[PDB]
Structures are given as structure tokens and as C-alpha cells.
């Protein structure tokens, strides 16, 4: 499967090398190969998967935004539209690839809260990225798929994880972005970010120095957004 002949351990090692070399397309292909071996992923390996694809899709989203801006300017030749469509299509394929890995079969095999919440968050994230470029007939159903993934992950995280858990915090952060940027629900976005921040603050006293640093890092992002949004 491009990577079907390489050992799982070698794929993981090369993913780590590509990260060091900032070769994120390679890193993604390696981690896709690792996932397709069929074994569950460790916490470190789930983070490698997320890092790889987030960087790949991140460059595509930035390109798409530059081009969409030019295209909107141009209607204030078909080339700008054609090339925005090319980038858009490549973004959608990356998102479809990640969603396919989650659906076949990472989520259904994830029984622990840390793995299951991580993967459901990712599912929400990649539907959100699809939503960012979607325009109609599917735009509503894509939004509803992101919302549903995020909501299931929130319910699990509230039952199973402490309020300072970095996965729980990154989840709540991204759901609040979803509310503000995608769902036209800025009040929900602000409420969630506030409630999330305040409940984590009240749980910080239970953490070690290194866990405190992990949690407060994400809390600051919630605060940065609240400053932007209010």
C-alpha cells in the first residue's frame, strides 16, 4: 500500500525522522502506513499521526485561503478559480484519507478514553476542515458530522477525564472554534471556552509541575480566543 512492505517499527522510526526534517507529507505517508498495519496506536503514535496530517492540511488551508481571497477580489479568466479548486480538491482528499483511517478502523477499536476521545476529536477536526471549504447541499451535513463527532468526544471526556486533561482541553478548544468559525454560534463558543477554562483552573492544584505546564499551555489558547472574541 506503498508502505505495505515496510515494517511497522521502521515506519514509526521514519515518521519521527521526517518530523525532524520537516517532511510532513512523508511523515503522513509513513503514519498512514503504520495505521494500515491494523494494530492499535500508542499515545506517542497517535500524536505522530496527528502532527503529520495537521501540518499537511495546515499548508493546504493556508494556500486555499490565499487563493480564495484572490478569487473574491477578482469578482469585486478561469485560472484563479481553477487553481483554488485544485488546492481545494487536494485538501478534501487529505481530509477523506484521515477520516477513512479513523473509520477503518481506529475509532471502533479504541476502548480507552484517551484514545477514543483523541480519535473522535480528530474526526471533528477533519470534518471542520472540510466544512471550511464546503458550499451547499453538503455543507450542512458536513457541519452536522463535525458537531456529532465533537459532541460524542465531549460526553466521553466529561465522564472519563479530569478537566485539566490536555486532550479534553484541546477538544473543548477546537469545539469552541467550530462554534465560532463554522456554526455561526459565537455565544456557544464563548460560553464553552469560559466554562472549560474555569473548570480547569480549579483542578490545576492537583497537577505536577510538568502536567501543570501541559494544561496551562492549552488554557492560554482558550484565553487568547476569549480575548479575540469578546
Amino acid at each position: 500500500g506503498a508502505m505495505g512492505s515496510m515494517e511497522r517499527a521502521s515506519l514509526i522510526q521514519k515518521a519521527k525522522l521526517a518530523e525532524q526534517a520537516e517532511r510532513y507529507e512523508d511523515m503522513a505517508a509513513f503514519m498512514k502506513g503504520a495505521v494500515e498495519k491494523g494494530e492499535e496506536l500508542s499515545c506517542e503514535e497517535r500524536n505522530l499521526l496527528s502532527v503529520a496530517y495537521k501540518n499537511v492540511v495546515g499548508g493546504q488551508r493556508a494556500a486555499w485561503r490565499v487563493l480564495s481571497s484572490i478569487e473574491q477580489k477578482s469578482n469585486e479568466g478561469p485560472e484563479v478559480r481553477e487553481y483554488r479548486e485544485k488546492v481545494e480538491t487536494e485538501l478534501q482528499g487529505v481530509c477523506d484519507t484521515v477520516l477513512g483511517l479513523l473509520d477503518s478502523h481506529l475509532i471502533k477499536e479504541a476502548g480507552d478514553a484517551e484514545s477514543r476521545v483523541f480519535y473522535l476529536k480528530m474526526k471533528g477536526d477533519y470534518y471542520r476542515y472540510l466544512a471550511e471549504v464546503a458550499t451547499g447541499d453538503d455543507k450542512k451535513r458536513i457541519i452536522d458530522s463535525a458537531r456529532s463527532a465533537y459532541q460524542e468526544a465531549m460526553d466521553i471526556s466529561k465522564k472519563e477525564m479530569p478537566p485539566t486533561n490536555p486532550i479534553r482541553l484541546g477538544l473543548a478548544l477546537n469545539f469552541s472554534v467550530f462554534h465560532y468559525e463554522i456554526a455561526n454560534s459565537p455565544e456557544e463558543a464563548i460560553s464553552l471556552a469560559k466554562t472549560t477554562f474555569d473548570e480547569a483552573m480549579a483542578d490545576l492544584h492537583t497537577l505536577s509541575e510538568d502536567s501543570y505546564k501541559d494544561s496551562t499551555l492549552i488554557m492560554q489558547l482558550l484565553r487568547d480566543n476569549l480575548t479575540l472574541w469578546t
Binding site: 502532527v51 490536555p166 484541546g170 477538544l171 489558547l221
Partner: peptide, 10 residues
């Protein structure tokens, strides 16, 4: 413009 989560979460 809104900040989202880092990819890597402990």
C-alpha cells in the same frame, strides 16, 4: 484567526 489545538496532546 481563532487559535486551535496543537496536534500533539499529552
Amino acid at each position: 484567526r481563532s487559535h486551535s489545538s496543537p496536534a500533539s496532546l499529552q
